């Protein structure tokens, strides 16, 4: 792919809208719209990436490449077939990416798109939202069971916390929906403070599954949250906490 | 059955 | 373009 564009502005804000949801526009400018629709089950996924030519002029040598770090490539298997290199004016084309999670991962793939448009050369780079929580599935459990598991994860490096300013209104119902969207079960009457949220789930990867517990604590007067994750793996607590911290 | 501490 | 998949 030769010289690669630096990540488009808005790439990171956009990437964050795709963590608890599967459907959306990932990138759009005056020439091109990139849309996604995905679904996951256990350690697998299927993503549809749609490329729309918003102009009256054909794109030639239209070349989407997915670019992964050397470690990412060992943790995540992406399979696709490239699009035809010519995209007509007004057309939307697509590709299907078949995804297999081999083990826990923290980096995101980059989608790089290059093409000719008239006499110009176009180069777009954006982060692809394939994230560890996409392999996160809910675990329902009573309070007693929760606290047993919580107390088993008492090593310092198993726990990660973050304190942050709410980006959105601290809307109870929407907060519950994003926790669910993230892949967690929402467990009621575990924290005796009814303002607090508690979650459990399991990450499903080809080689190992990791049990995860979470607690979110809003302070509506201060407009701030504390999120605590405990998992058996420091990298998994880290990643899920960073991800989940950007949702509220 | 408890969390040891609390944010608020 | 109205023939496109949309992402609402």
């Amino acid at each position: 792919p030769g010289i690669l564009a630096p990540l488009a502005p808005g790439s990171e804000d956009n990437f964050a809208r795709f963590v608890c949801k599967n459907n959306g526009v990932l990138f759009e400018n005056q020439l091109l719209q990139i849309g996604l629709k995905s679904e996951f089950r256990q350690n697998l996924g299927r993503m549809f990436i749609f490329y729309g030519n918003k102009t009256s002029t054909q794109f030639l040598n239209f070349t989407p490449t997915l670019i992964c770090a050397d470690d990412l490539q060992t943790n995540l298997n992406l399979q696709t077939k490239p699009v035809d290199p010519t995209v007509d004016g007004g057309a939307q084309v697509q590709q299907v990416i078949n995804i297999e999670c081999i083990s826990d991962f923290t980096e995101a793939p980059v989608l790089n798109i290059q093409f000719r448009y008239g006499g110009t050369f176009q180069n777009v780079s954006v982060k692809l939202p394939i994230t560890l929580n996409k392999f996160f599935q809910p675990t329902e459990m009573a309070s007693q069971d929760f606290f047993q598991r919580w107390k088993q994860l008492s090593n310092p490096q198993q726990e990660v916390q973050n304190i942050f300013k709410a980006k959105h209104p601290m809307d109870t119902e929407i907060t519950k929906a994003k926790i669910i969207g993230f892949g967690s079960a929402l467990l009621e009457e575990v924290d005796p403070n009814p303002a607090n949220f508690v979650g459990a789930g399991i990450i499903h990867t080809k080689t190992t599954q990791i049990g995860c517990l979470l607690r979110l604590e809003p302070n509506l007067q201060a407009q701030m949250y504390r999120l605590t994750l405990r998992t058996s793996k420091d990298t998994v607590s880290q990643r899920l906490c960073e991800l989940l911290s950007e949702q509220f | 059955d408890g969390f040891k501490d609390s944010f608020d | 373009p109205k023939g496109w998949v949309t992402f609402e």
Side-chain angles (χ1 to χ4, degrees):
Chain A
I3 75 184
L4 311 172
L7 294 173
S11 165
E12 183 67 42
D13 297 7
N14 275 299
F15 173 87
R17 302 172 49 69
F18 281 97
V19 171
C20 295
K21 94 171 152 59
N22 280 320
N23 170 42
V25 185
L26 184 61
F27 176 81
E28 182 165 356
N29 74 3
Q30 298 164 0
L31 322 176
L32 175 74
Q33 183 187 62
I34 308 180
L36 306 170
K37 287 184 187 281
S38 288
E39 63 189 312
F40 303 85
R41 182 174 167 176
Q42 307 197 325
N43 67 315
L44 308 178
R46 185 169 283 150
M47 181 180 276
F48 288 90
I49 311 177
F50 296 87
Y51 301 104
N53 181 337
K54 295 170 64 170
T55 75
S56 39
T57 309
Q58 298 195 311
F59 299 167
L60 316 174
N61 302 114
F62 189 85
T63 313
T65 315
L66 295 166
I67 304 155
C68 293
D70 321 44
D71 282 354
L72 186 53
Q73 296 188 42
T74 76
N75 294 146
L76 180 68
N77 174 39
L78 302 188
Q79 175 279 307
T80 196
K81 289 149 172 175
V83 289
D84 187 284
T86 303
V87 180
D88 290 342
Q92 180 180 66
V93 301
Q94 70 193 66
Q95 67 186 291
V96 182
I97 307 170
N98 286 302
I99 299 169
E100 173 193 24
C101 174
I102 302 291
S103 188
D104 86 274
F105 68 97
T106 295
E107 289 308 309
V110 176
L111 179 70
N112 176 260
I113 313 101
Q114 288 186 56
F115 52 106
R116 300 172 57 190
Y117 168 57
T120 74
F121 290 83
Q122 301 295 320
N123 200 321
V124 182
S125 299
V126 294
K127 217 176 266 182
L128 205 60
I130 300 172
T131 52
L132 186 56
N133 64 287
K134 296 307 175 181
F135 307 103
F136 196 27
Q137 295 289 339
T139 320
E140 296 301 346
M141 65 184 71
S143 180
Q144 229 184 235
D145 279 341
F146 180 92
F147 287 113
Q148 194 161 89
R149 292 157 175 74
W150 183 262
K151 295 180 137 38
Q152 288 159 17
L153 291 169
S154 60
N155 303 15
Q157 282 170 176
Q158 287 173 325
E159 183 181 272
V160 176
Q161 300 181 290
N162 193 8
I163 298 180
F164 55 92
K165 190 72 188 294
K167 297 178 181 46
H168 309 293
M170 310 173 95
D171 182 321
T172 303
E173 292 306 316
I174 287 177
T175 290
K176 295 180 191 177
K178 269 160 186 161
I179 295 173
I180 289 151
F182 185 67
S184 184
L186 187 69
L187 300 178
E188 308 267 341
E189 296 190 26
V190 178
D191 194 315
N193 185 342
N196 292 342
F197 311 85
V198 177
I202 295 161
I203 291 295
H204 288 250
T205 84
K206 190 178 193 139
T207 64
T208 194
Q209 297 179 347
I210 295 155
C212 310
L213 305 180
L214 76 75
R215 186 198 188 189
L216 178 69
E217 302 174 77
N219 186 325
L220 268 70
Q221 175 280 326
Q223 209 67 23
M224 271 188 306
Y225 282 103
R226 187 171 78 167
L227 181 55
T228 306
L229 267 290
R230 289 187 181 191
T231 89
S232 74
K233 203 166 161 171
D234 59 352
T235 61
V236 175
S237 310
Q238 297 165 211
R239 193 36 169 180
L240 296 184
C241 188
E242 107 198 338
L243 285 171
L244 190 58
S245 280
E246 303 297 318
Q247 305 298 324
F248 309 101
Chain B
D1 285 43
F3 297 107
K4 294 275 158 174
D5 91 319
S6 278
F7 187 48
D8 183 9
Chain C
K2 207 159 286 197
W4 295 356
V5 178
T6 49
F7 310 92
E8 310 198 54

